[PDB]
Design a protein around this ligand. Structure first.
Ligand SMILES: [Cl-]
Length: 314
């Protein structure tokens, strides 16, 4: 049966990502050139040479990861890919929703770069330093983590930020509450419970100022219905209405990334091959943990592009 394209998010960035592809294909080189122009900045120098901690800043990582994904898309398209004909659905992990929408034609490349810079800037600035944290948990189900969130409510706000599959759940919120939640998760026998004490509290109610910033930015940008539906992080259904998609992108900023349910939905609704478009193998690792029967393939190199085009029957 069919294919879905999935687009990675924060944590998939790597120094030098996309550099080889730009050397090999003008289609890839031009994506980075346009992103630099759109942002009035040589972002590509940070992408290709680091330092890693500068590339990892969310105001850099968000437009950078999208650029790598879109370079892959443009190379595939030059080599004959028609997305509307060959791809059933698109989806992406948080910032990856924007990459997915650009690949599906909803926003221009220049606008997507600017939207992601606005998003990263607004997220970095949403809460004062030290006020938020995140934590990465493995081995507790959603119900049990929701209970931990309730247990620590007296200390402060703690919410599920990502449900990633494979027993991986990321929590987020106020620093003290999240720290306590890690202690509780460890006590309950989590296989892993790791505090990220300086993280912005992504996908928590604390991100409200960044949601408001995205609402204003998304209201003015030119947009078109995507050529294939987006399986939105908030709704886990195929979305093609640009007005509703804008609302869901705003809601996404403060809400849970429902990634497990996304892969389960896609796999049950006529897709047997999940492609990860861009940098790294993070989503592919998750897909294989969620569903052992689907074929999950990375698409980041020339070789992988060729293989994906063959699987798609281009
Ligand atoms: Cl990261």
């Amino acid at each position: 049966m069919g294919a879905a394209f999935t687009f990675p998010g924060q944590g998939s960035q790597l120094i030098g990502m996309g550099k080889v592809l730009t050397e090999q294909f003008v289609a890839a080189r031009m994506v980075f050139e346009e992103v630099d122009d759109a942002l009035s900045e040589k972002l590509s120098d940070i992408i290709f040479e680091g330092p890693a901690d500068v590339l990892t800043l969310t105001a850099n990582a968000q437009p950078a990861l999208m650029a790598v994904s879109m370079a892959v898309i443009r190379v595939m398209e030059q080599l004959g890919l028609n997305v509307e004909k060959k791809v059933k659905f698109v989806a992406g992990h948080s910032l990856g929703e924007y990459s997915a929408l650009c690949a599906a034609g909803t926003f221009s490349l220049t606008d997507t770069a600017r939207l992601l810079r606005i998003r990263g800037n607004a997220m970095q600035a949403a809460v004062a330093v030290g006020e938020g944290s995140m934590a990465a948990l493995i081995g507790l189900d959603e119900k049990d983590v929701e209970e931990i969130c309730e247990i620590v409510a007296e200390e402060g706000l703690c919410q599920i930020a990502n449900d990633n599959g494979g027993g991986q759940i990321v929590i987020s919120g106020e620093a003290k509450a999240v720290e306590t939640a890690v202690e509780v998760a460890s006590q309950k026998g989590a296989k892993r419970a790791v505090l990220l004490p300086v993280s912005a509290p992504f996908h928590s109610a604390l991100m409200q100022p960044a949601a408001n910033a995205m609402k204003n930015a998304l209201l003015t940008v030119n947009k078109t219905a995507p050529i294939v539906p987006l399986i939105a992080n908030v709704s886990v259904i195929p979305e093609s209405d640009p007005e509703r998609i804008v609302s869901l992108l705003v809601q996404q900023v403060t809400g849970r990334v429902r990634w497990r349910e996304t892969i389960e939905w896609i796999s049950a609704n006529g897709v047997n091959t999940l492609f990860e478009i861009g940098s790294g193998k993070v989503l592919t690792g998750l897909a294989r943990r969620i569903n052992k029967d689907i074929k999950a393939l990375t698409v980041g190199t020339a070789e992988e592009i060729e293989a994906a085009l063959r699987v798609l029957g281009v």
